[PDB]
Amino acid sequence: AGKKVLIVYAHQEPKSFNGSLKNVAVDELSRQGCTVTVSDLYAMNFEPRATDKDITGTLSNPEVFNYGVETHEAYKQRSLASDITDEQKKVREADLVIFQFPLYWFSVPAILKGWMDRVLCQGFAFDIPGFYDSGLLQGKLALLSVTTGGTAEMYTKTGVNGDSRYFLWPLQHGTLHFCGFKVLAPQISFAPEIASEEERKGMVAAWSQRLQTIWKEEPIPCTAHWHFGQ
Amino acid sequence: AGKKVLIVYAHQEPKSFNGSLKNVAVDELSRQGCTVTVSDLYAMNFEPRATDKDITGTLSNPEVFNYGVETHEAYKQRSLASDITDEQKKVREADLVIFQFPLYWFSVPAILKGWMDRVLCQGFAFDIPGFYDSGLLQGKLALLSVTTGGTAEMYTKTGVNGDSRYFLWPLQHGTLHFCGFKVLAPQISFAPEIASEEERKGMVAAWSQRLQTIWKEEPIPCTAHWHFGQ
Numbered sequence: 001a002g003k004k005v006l007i008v009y010a011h012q013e014p015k016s017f018n019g020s021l022k023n024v025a026v027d028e029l030s031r032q033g034c035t036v037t038v039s040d041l042y043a044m045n046f047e048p049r050a051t052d053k054d055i056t057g058t059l060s061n062p063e064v065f066n067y068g069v070e071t072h073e074a075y076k077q078r079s080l081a082s083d084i085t086d087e088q089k090k091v092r093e094a095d096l097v098i099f100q101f102p103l104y105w106f107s108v109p110a111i112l113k114g115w116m117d118r119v120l121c122q123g124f125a126f127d128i129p130g131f132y133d134s135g136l137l138q139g140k141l142a143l144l145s146v147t148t149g150g151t152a153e154m155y156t157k158t159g160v161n162g163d164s165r166y167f168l169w170p171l172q173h174g175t176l177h178f179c180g181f182k183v184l185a186p187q188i189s190f191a192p193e194i195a196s197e198e199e200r201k202g203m204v205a206a207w208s209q210r211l212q213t214i215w216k217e218e219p220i221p222c223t224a225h226w227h228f229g230q
Numbered sequence: 231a232g233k234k235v236l237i238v239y240a241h242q243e244p245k246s247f248n249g250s251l252k253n254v255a256v257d258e259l260s261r262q263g264c265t266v267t268v269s270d271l272y273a274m275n276f277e278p279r280a281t282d283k284d285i286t287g288t289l290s291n292p293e294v295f296n297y298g299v300e301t302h303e304a305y306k307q308r309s310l311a312s313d314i315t316d317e318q319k320k321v322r323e324a325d326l327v328i329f330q331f332p333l334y335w336f337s338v339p340a341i342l343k344g345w346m347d348r349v350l351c352q353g354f355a356f357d358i359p360g361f362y363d364s365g366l367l368q369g370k371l372a373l374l375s376v377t378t379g380g381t382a383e384m385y386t387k388t389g390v391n392g393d394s395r396y397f398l399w400p401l402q403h404g405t406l407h408f409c410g411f412k413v414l415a416p417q418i419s420f421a422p423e424i425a426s427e428e429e430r431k432g433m434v435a436a437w438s439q440r441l442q443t444i445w446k447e448e449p450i451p452c453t454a455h456w457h458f459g460q
C-alpha cells in the first residue's frame with residue numbers, strides 16, 4: 001500500500017511448487033492491500049521468438065531486417081505488437097517486478113527469455129544513452145524467485161555447479177540492472193523435489209514471510225564484486 | 231575433413247553479420263571435406279516453449295504436469311515430438327556443434343534457449359547420475375560463436391559489462407559441460423555495428439582462418455577458475 005506489483009510467472013502446472021510460490025505471493029501482497037497483476041506466460045501462450053511480426057504496419061527497412069532497430073522505431077511510433085505493449089504497460093505501472101520460475105539450464109525458461117527479449121526493448125527499458133544507471137526503468141524494483149533441481153551444496157563456489165550468484169549475473173546485472181532496475185536479493189528455493197514436505201512448507205512459508213516485509217528491503221549492490229568477489 | 235559439424239544458427243536475417251559468420255563456417259568446413267548441417271531456427275519456426283505438446287503418448291502423471299519427468303519418460307518410450315527428435319539426431323551424429331548467435335540479454339536469443347531446453351532432455355543429453363564429465367554427449371565438442379552490441383572494452387573485468395567470460399558460464403558450464411561436451415574457446419565478434427567495413431571483413435576472415443585449424447585445438451578447462459579467475 002500504495003504499491004503495484006507485477007509477477008511474471010513461468011511454469012506450466014498450477015499445482016507445482018512454482019505455482020504455489022506464485023499463489024502465496026498473490027495472497028500475501030493482496031492481503032497487504034497492494035495492487036497485483038500476474039503474467040502467466042504459458043497460460044497466455046506467450047510468443048518467445050523475436051521476429052518481424054513484433055512490428056505492425058510497414059517495416060522501417062524491409063530489405064534487411066534488424067530486430068533491434070525495428071522494435072526501437074516501432075516503440076517510438078506506437079507500432080509494437082499488442083502482446084508486447086500489454087506487457088510494457090504492466091511493467092510501466094509496476095513498482096516491483098517479481099519473476100517466478102524454475103531454473104532451466106542456469107537461466108530462465110525460454111518462454112521467460114522471450115518475454116525479456118521482446119518486452120524490454122530499446123526506447124522502453126533503456127536507450128543507447130539509456131543504460132545501467134541511465135536505464136529507463138530506474139525507480140523500479142525487481143526480484144528473482146527461482147527454484148532449482150540441484151541442492152544448495154551443489155551451488156557453492158567449489159560444488160559441481162558453482163555459486164548460485166554465478167548464474168544470476170546475466171539476469172540480475174546484464175538484464176535487470178541494465179534496464180535501470182534496483183535488484184532485491186534473490187529468493188532461491190533449492191531442490192524442492194528432494195526436500196520433504198514440510199521443508200517444502202518451510203520454503204513456501206519463508207517466501208510468504210519474506211513478502212511481509214519486502215518493502216523494507218534495500219537493493220543489492222549489483223556489481224561484479226557481489227556476484228563473483230569476496 | 232573427417233568429421234560431422236552441426237551449426238545451430240539463431241538470426242532472423244540472412245544478410246546479417248551472424249549470417250555471414252554462419253556462411254563462412256559452412257564454406258570453410260565444406261572446403262575442408264567436413265560433413266556440415268545447419269539448423270536455422272528462425273527459418274524452421276522452431277518451437278521454444280517447453281509444453282505438454284512435446285509429449286504425444288500417455289503421460290506418466292496426467293493430473294500434475296512435470297516437464298522434466300514427462301520428457302525423460304517420452305524420450306525412453308519414443309513419444310517425443312518429432313521436431314525435438316529431429317534435432318537430437320543431428321546432435322547424435324555431430325562431432326562438433328557450433329552455436330552462432332547474437333548475444334541477447336547476456337545469453338542466447340530465446341529461440342535458441344528453447345532449443346537447449348527442449349532438445350537436451352534427460353536420457354538423451356545427461357542422466358542423473360551421468361552429467362558433467364559423465365554427461366551423455368561426452369566425446370563431442372561444442373563452440374559458442376557470439377556477436378555483441380557491446381565493445382571488447384565494455385566486456386572487461388573493470389568495464390560496465392564485466393568480463394566476457396562471466397556471461398559464458400551458464401552456457402559453457404551449466405549447459406554444454408553438464409551434457410558432457412568438451413568446450414572449445416568461444417569466438418566472440420565484438421560490436422560489428424560500430425566497426426568499420428574493413429574491421430567487419432576482418433572479423434569474418436579471423437573466424438574463417440580459425441576454422442582452418444579447428445580440429446587441432448584443445449578444449450578450455452571449463453571451470454569456475456577459467457571463467458572468474460582467483
Ligand SMILES: Cc1cc2nc3c(=O)[nH]c(=O)nc-3n(C[C@H](O)[C@H](O)[C@H](O)COP(=O)(O)OP(=O)(O)OC[C@H]3O[C@@H](n4cnc5c(N)ncnc54)[C@H](O)[C@@H]3O)c2cc1C
Pocket residue numbers: 011015016017018019020101102103104105106107147148149150151192193197198200201204280296297298346347348404
Ligand atoms: C529444461 C530443464 C532444464 C533445467 N535446468 C536446470 C538447471 O540448470 N539447474 C538446476 O538446478 N535444475 C534444472 N532443472 C530442474 C528445475 O529447475 C526443477 O525441476 C524445478 O526448479 C522444480 O520446481 P517445480 O516447481 O517444477 O517443482 P515441482 O516438481 O512441481 O515441486 C516439487 C514438489 O513440491 C510439491 N509442492 C507443490 N506445492 C507445494 C506446497 N505448497 N507445499 C509443499 N510442497 C509443495 C509438489 O507437489 C512436488 O511434489 C531443469 C529442468 C528442466 C525441465
Ligand SMILES: Cc1cc2nc3c(=O)[nH]c(=O)nc-3n(C[C@H](O)[C@H](O)[C@H](O)COP(=O)(O)OP(=O)(O)OC[C@H]3O[C@@H](n4cnc5c(N)ncnc54)[C@H](O)[C@@H]3O)c2cc1C
Pocket residue numbers: 050066067068117118174241245246247248249250331332333334335336337377378379380381422423427430431434
Ligand atoms: C533483444 C536484444 C538483446 C540484446 N542484448 C545484448 C546484450 O546483452 N549485450 C550486447 O552486447 N548486445 C546485446 N544486443 C545487441 C546484439 O547482440 C547485436 O545487435 C548483434 O550481436 C549484432 O549482430 P548482427 O549479426 O545482428 O549485426 P548486423 O547489424 O547484421 O551487422 C552489422 C553490420 O555488418 C554488416 N555485414 C554483414 N555481413 C558482413 C560481411 N560479410 N562483411 C562486412 N560487413 C558485414 C551488416 O550489413 C551490418 O552493417 C541485443 C540485441 C537485441 C535485439
Ligand SMILES: C=Nc1c(Cl)c(N)c2c3c(cc(C(N)=O)nc13)C(=O)N2C
Pocket residue numbers: 105106148149150151154161298350351352358404405408
Ligand atoms: C542442467 N540441466 C538439468 C535438467 Cl535439464 C533437468 N531436467 C534436471 C537438472 C537437475 C539438476 C541440475 C543441476 N545442474 O544441478 N541440472 C539439471 C535436476 O534435478 N533435473 C530434474
Ligand SMILES: C=Nc1c(Cl)c(N)c2c3c(cc(C(N)=O)nc13)C(=O)N2C
Pocket residue numbers: 068120121122174178335336378379380381384391
Ligand atoms: C543489454 N541489452 C542490449 C540491447 Cl537489448 C540492444 N538492442 C543493444 C545492446 C547493445 C549493447 C549492450 C551492452 N550490454 O553492451 N546491450 C544491449 C547494443 O548496441 N544494442 C543495439
Ligand SMILES: [Zn+2]
Pocket residue numbers: 172173174177178221222223224
Ligand atoms: Zn549490476
Ligand SMILES: [Zn+2]
Pocket residue numbers: 402403404407408451452453
Ligand atoms: Zn565447465
